[PDB]
Amino acid sequence: SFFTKLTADELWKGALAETGAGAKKGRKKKRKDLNRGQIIGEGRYGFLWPGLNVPLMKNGAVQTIAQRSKEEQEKVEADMIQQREEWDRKKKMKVKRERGWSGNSWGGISLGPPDPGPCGETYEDFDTRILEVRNVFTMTAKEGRKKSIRVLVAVGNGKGAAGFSIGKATDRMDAFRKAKNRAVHHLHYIERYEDHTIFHDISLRFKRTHIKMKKQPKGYGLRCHRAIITICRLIGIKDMYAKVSGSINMLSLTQGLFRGLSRQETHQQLADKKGLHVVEIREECGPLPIVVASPRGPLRKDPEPEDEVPDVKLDWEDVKTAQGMKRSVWSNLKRAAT
Amino acid sequence: PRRKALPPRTEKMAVDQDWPSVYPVAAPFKPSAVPLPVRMGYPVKKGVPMAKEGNLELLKIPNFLHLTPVAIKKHCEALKDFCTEWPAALDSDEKCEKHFPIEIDSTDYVSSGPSVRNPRARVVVLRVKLSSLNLDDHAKKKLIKLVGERYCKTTDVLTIKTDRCPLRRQNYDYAVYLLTVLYHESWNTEEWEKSK
Amino acid sequence: VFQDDPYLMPASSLESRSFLLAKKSGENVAKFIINSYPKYFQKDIAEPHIPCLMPEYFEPQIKDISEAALKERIELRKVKASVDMFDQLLQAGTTVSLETTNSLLDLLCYYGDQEPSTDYHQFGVTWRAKNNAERIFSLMPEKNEHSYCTMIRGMVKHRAYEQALNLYTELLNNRLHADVYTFNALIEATVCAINEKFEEKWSKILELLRHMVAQKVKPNLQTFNTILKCLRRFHVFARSPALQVLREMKAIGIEPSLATYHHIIRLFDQPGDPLKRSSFIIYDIMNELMGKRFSPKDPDDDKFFQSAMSICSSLRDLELAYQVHGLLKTGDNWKFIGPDQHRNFYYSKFFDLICLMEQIDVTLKWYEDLIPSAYFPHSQTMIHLLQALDVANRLEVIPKIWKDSKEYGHTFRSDLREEILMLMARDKHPPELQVAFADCAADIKSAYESQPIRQTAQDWPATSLNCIAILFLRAGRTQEAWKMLGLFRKHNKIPRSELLNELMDSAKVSNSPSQAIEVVELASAFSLPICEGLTQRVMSDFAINQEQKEALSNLTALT
Amino acid sequence: TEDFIKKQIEEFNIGKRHLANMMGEDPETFTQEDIDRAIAYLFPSGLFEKRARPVMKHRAIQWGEDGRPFHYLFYTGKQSYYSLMHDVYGMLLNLEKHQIGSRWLIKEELEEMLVEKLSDLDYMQFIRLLEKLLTSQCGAAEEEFVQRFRRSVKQLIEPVQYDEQGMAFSKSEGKRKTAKAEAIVYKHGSGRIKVNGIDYQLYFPITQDREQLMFPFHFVDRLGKHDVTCTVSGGGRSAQAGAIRLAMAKALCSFVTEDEVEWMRQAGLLTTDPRVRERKKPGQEGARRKFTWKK
Amino acid sequence: KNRAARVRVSKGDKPVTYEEAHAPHYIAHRKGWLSLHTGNLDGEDHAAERTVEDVFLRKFMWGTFPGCLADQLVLKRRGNQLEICAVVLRQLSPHKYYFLVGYSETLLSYFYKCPVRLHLQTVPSKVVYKYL
Amino acid sequence: HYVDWRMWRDVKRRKMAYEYADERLRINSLRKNTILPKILQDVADEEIAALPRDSCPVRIRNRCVMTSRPRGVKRRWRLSRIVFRHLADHGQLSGIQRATW
RNA sequence: GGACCUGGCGGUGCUUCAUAUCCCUCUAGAGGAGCCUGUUCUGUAAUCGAUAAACCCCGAUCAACCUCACCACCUCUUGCUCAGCCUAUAUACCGCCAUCUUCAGCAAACCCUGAUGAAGGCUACAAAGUAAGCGCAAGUACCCACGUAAAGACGUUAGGUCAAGGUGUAGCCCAUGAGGUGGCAAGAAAUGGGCUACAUUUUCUACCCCAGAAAAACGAUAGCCCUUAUGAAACUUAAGGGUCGAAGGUGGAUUUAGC
């Protein structure tokens, strides 16, 4: 019949069964458009209607009704089938994503720049990276076990300004959006020595996570925990060592890393505090003294105490490595460029 | 480049223009033609009624924009030629009954659709006051008795409704013939009429 | 006819014609579907019955070899099947009416063995030497006056002039009498058959008229219309007998129609000066037609107005054009305006003459009344309107006209943009006029950026860029002027000396040295002789600093 | 912004001029009522919700182009309400230093007045402050302020007419259920009541209906002092009796004193009984009787 | 719950026109009938014929203008005249629109034996009354 | 191309009943009277019985004209209750509206 | 294994409550009888679906033939259809709905707190929440502003409908399709609902409310017979008439509805 026909949208809604008893709580087919490759005025009879499917004027004259030959109609059908096959192949194939720390992990995966601000603010210079995606469940009487997604997101412009945030949502993409839009309002500014490394070694203990960061020369690379590698790439640090001990909780790790990096003391601040030239000694430069910092105010003529023995709390791992007693089969392993 | 939609011609319109020229005949509401900033539709919370552009509610209305009072006056000025003056000698209904005792009622039905046929339009009603006929006591009594329920004693009006024939003209002719034969038979006298 | 919607409102004349052609194509496709599948439209629910909404029939259904099938084919004009059935009937020897064979000859001669063009399955002589019409005429058992009449008319229609002469000779042999239309066809065939001079043609036409009088055949408008059409070939000689033919029409009582006057006007439209002779005819024709409603009588009637207005445009007579238009706008006479092309040409010439001669106020009134209500103006018409406005110093509406240009598909017309820019930038104006002109120039620049000629590297006219920069400077939009100074060398277009002078004039008020120096950079780049003097002005009217004057000295050394 | 509003105002003025031209009215005296009538005629819409019908008619922003808000209490988020509270508190301070058929407007009315949204507790606070202002022996300058927030919370009587016979009479009408009655009561009479040309004791054999007819005249102590002619149609015996009673009371109001009119109104003789038959609904036996609930 | 001719709010993202945003109990109150004919009046006949013709016209104009109709059609009947008022998008070229107007008008006029007319109002995009 | 074979059967029945309507009317009028002789009425009875079964107008069933639903069809619109509800709810039917009183 | 977070369900009490509502109280009923009707069972060769509330005068605002999808028998094969299927799956769906709902909550999007942990965000003489939107409300229909309708979100029962129709999946294609003729449908029985009553506030008649009679009769729309209406067909439908005058004598626990 004819009056029993329906629209494409209603038929697709009925066939796909997007809603129902099975889809209500989770107790494969996908929509395909049949109008993308169909042109008005094209039928199996292969008629040419002037002005609808063929140009209204040919050689400057009004065209008349024409019918394509059987071979021409076969050619047109072959072209339509070829176009449909090519579009189906293009839809089936995809531009493969760049995997993060592992193929099935969400960490390290870039999310693109954060959404632009309302008052003419754009964050196209910022890169967004995922650090943890956890499924968190709660016991509610109304719904039994409620499921949500908590996502830890780190953003950074590669020039010191970087931040992190936590996004809770029922949908993963919504959590990503929330976290990455909230992070840019919580941007620490990390001071980098020579725009490539930290100013000094940082030993910190955030909750039950110890982070030991060692300042390293140019070209040493990022020999750090993969999360710390990602965060340092976001900040703009290119050479640093970092060892994580105790609890390796990602949230505590990120919070402690940001706390330590923000609390680090620059050379200029040290020079102003102690009123003395901060002079750099480099082995590659020999005995040449490089004055990297000078006090802003009057210089201090006190020759400072020549401390015979520094009362500094050393770390046993560093001393063991320096003396060679450490023989771990995992240290100094050759790894990909970081 | 893709085609650019022109601004509506309402912008080019003048305040003192001749509106009936814009809409000569009945036509659907056209936002590009109506210069009025009319709005229709139930407003949303903290909202305003939808504008005329794309307003399906305005499109639904059987608008009277082609029948403005100025347009009505011009149309009637044109159509006054076709009319004919009513006779002033019978300005009252009493003179109408004095000169035209027979009234003919016929209904014409107008409805949407491709077919104009309507059976209800075939009915004809003939109304005549018997006091306006030339009758005596015997003829009047016989005619009243013959017509029966077709005559109302209160109004002294005989009403004959004819719909037996398919057509309007046929029913009218039948009504006239029925009145004529009723009159002539009423004036006629028969043998059975004596035994009252 | 067009849908009253801004998207579907036609912009240009080409858009108008294309939209109408598309609508007609849709109607033709629908009718083709209706006739191809009539069984879907045979259900009648219309009361009263509407015959024009029923499917039509073009194919005959009678199959027996008899007069019925032949008549069905003749009335359906199916020439091939009619001829085959007539041959079969002649072979069988069955009866056929003389009128039926006459109708067959009429169909064949009018169509010339051309199958009628259904929905679907110029130069030279369209007639063919071998045809079934001549064969059937030879095999015709009995001939009559109407047979000769229709054969002559069809052969004249198909330019079978020699065959028409043969038919005339056969008519004379049969000693029968033709009618007025046959004599007109004979006159046309005699005139178009040979390239003889005027004397022979006129003598033959007069002899044919006298023969028609002798044959007791009365004249008609077609006779004089064809006489004028034939005499159009010999304008120089025919200028005199045209008035004689017209007076003959008046004396007989055959009132000349619109086509007769059109043919007389065309005959008087000899290549050369029309004031010498057309002045003696056009006013008399207008006086005769003045305040007279007309009816369709002759096929060329619709042309008249067009032709008249054309020569009106030649005479530069605004009053005559007004009289012609009033004749057109009198009663139903507007329906004689003609086809779309004739209407467009007539209105174009009329509005051009109005712009040329009429006062600018009435010119603008006519512009509002006719455009776009009557026709979409051509680019040349808009150029003439711009010229008329410039003459009347009413420059304030120039941007609006440009808007109208954007409304009429003239955005991409380079010549119109050049004219508008030149008119705007030619003279200095009060600040409001200047800023309006700058807005128009910016719109024109955007149009240039959006042109579809971008397929090839756009050849931006140097004059256009100079005028746009001049308008920007005079208004006060200097930044776009500097950017255009850069684009000059980007597009390799030579600047204007007046443009450099206006650059200096605009920069003097704001007292900007570097912007002045940049103009010297540009002029030295294009090595114009003005640069030297330009440099002097830069050294004179501007507080040039040390490095800017160093640049001036370097350009003085470089140029 | 204000630019959009001004553009809309100019567009409305131009459209008003076009509408006046189309209707042939004078563009000067073409007022809002004329606009509404013209729009209703030109676009006849029978949608019951009047807000959905076509209409041609004439919230704002609280800061300028520089970003500075206009009101000094803008950052409260409820600048109108808190400004009103500030003014009321100032008036109370001034009063302290120097020394019914009206009710308080509802929260919706206050929100409409202050074009803001207010909570119930805010409304109660403002009402208590206003009451304190009233009880503080506030002067006229504050009494007008109170009356800004005050909202106001008798039966019309037909006049006496005269007939051809010369009698003085009044006429009224009433209805009850599906019965409508029209009564004519003469100023002077002998207690005669004729319903539809029939004497009441014959048209109303039921004693209850006759008692209902007696009730109005007996209440004002006017039995036998008037003559009544009633025409009643529709309903049953009791509905007709009630309609005639109401019509007679309404007509007799024209002859009793205003005090007696008020007494009759308090006795219910003048209120039209709105109790009419309730429609049967689908899925249930009657107006309220549900079907037998099976188990 | 009533599921008839209603759009259910899910995320406040789905755009709906004025027609779709209103439930059936609003027809007499906020959205007039999409078709206007005298067949459904008192004492008038041929209601079923008009209904069938309206359904066919809707299903025919929906397929003749694929992806072009912005909203549902408006069918008006005046005497034997039939008018289809359609809100259409500006995606298609005007040549195709005019071709379709002529074709549809002629075909409907010959099919229903009535002088059908088609008035198109073009909009840049589907007008959104609200989001659901 | 009707909705179902039941609608096709009903269409056949309607066409056959319209074809044989006059013959049935005449024979039945011969039958439905007490004036003509009883033997003629009996031969008329056997004649009307000899007519094809599907020509009887009682066999005509008023099905919905769009879904062939045999029951719940409003005669004025010739539509089933479900289809009529759909069209009225979408507002495609003139005049018909939700009833509230 | 340590400490927390969110947790709930418990024939577990107390104090307030429910407004035709939980009980009592009010009125009229059902549960007793006949009849009508639906269901279950029995039976038949002889549909299906509905199945506590939320099925049971339900799909049906309706089955003598048709309807009809059932059965028996016979017939047809590119079939009215660019076939068809009332074939399986409502645990694939659209579509239209039930149900709490005689509910007022559902909520995106933000912000803040907990060291930026699973989480939390309440104070009005206010101490971090704001909220678009949806629903309620409002507005509208009917006779008001009341009332009744209408409306009534998100969720709940893998709730009902593949037999309104459409459609996913799977199956039949000389048949699970199509056509014709004929046929069921009863009662051992239980159950739901309805009608009529068991009378004297009644019955019959007149009247439409000032009467006269009846009163062991009251009481069948049932049974039997006949006629009539409709139809081609009445044994099976309806109406009327005649005949018969039966059960029944205000009905248990329980239970329905009404402000």
Ligand SMILES: [Mg+2]
């Ligand atoms: Mg992998």
Ligand SMILES: [Mg+2]
């Ligand atoms: Mg059985």
